[PDB]
Amino acid sequence: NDAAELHNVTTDLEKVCRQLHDPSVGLSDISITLFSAFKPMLAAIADIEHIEKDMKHQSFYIETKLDGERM
């Protein structure tokens, strides 16, 4: 049921296969753990005249985008 979330949190098939072996017995909690790669958070296309509607009408942070490698 929650294989995708655990895989994203841990980024390893072996751990997902081993921990989530039984179908009924799941994991109570799943979150980023030490020495376990996690999927980075990306950004979607930005509407140029709906920013406020996208921000729910609150102050927002703007920062110059950097051309490098995400790590």
Place this chain on the structure above:
DNA sequence: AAAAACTATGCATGCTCTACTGCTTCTGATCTAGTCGACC
């Protein structure tokens, strides 16, 4: 005095080292084109 036996020698064969020169083939170094992995 005359005939037969032993030794000197000497020229030619084949082998052996020793080297030299040429061709064929294997190994190694270098250059160039193509390919894979990671990202964005």
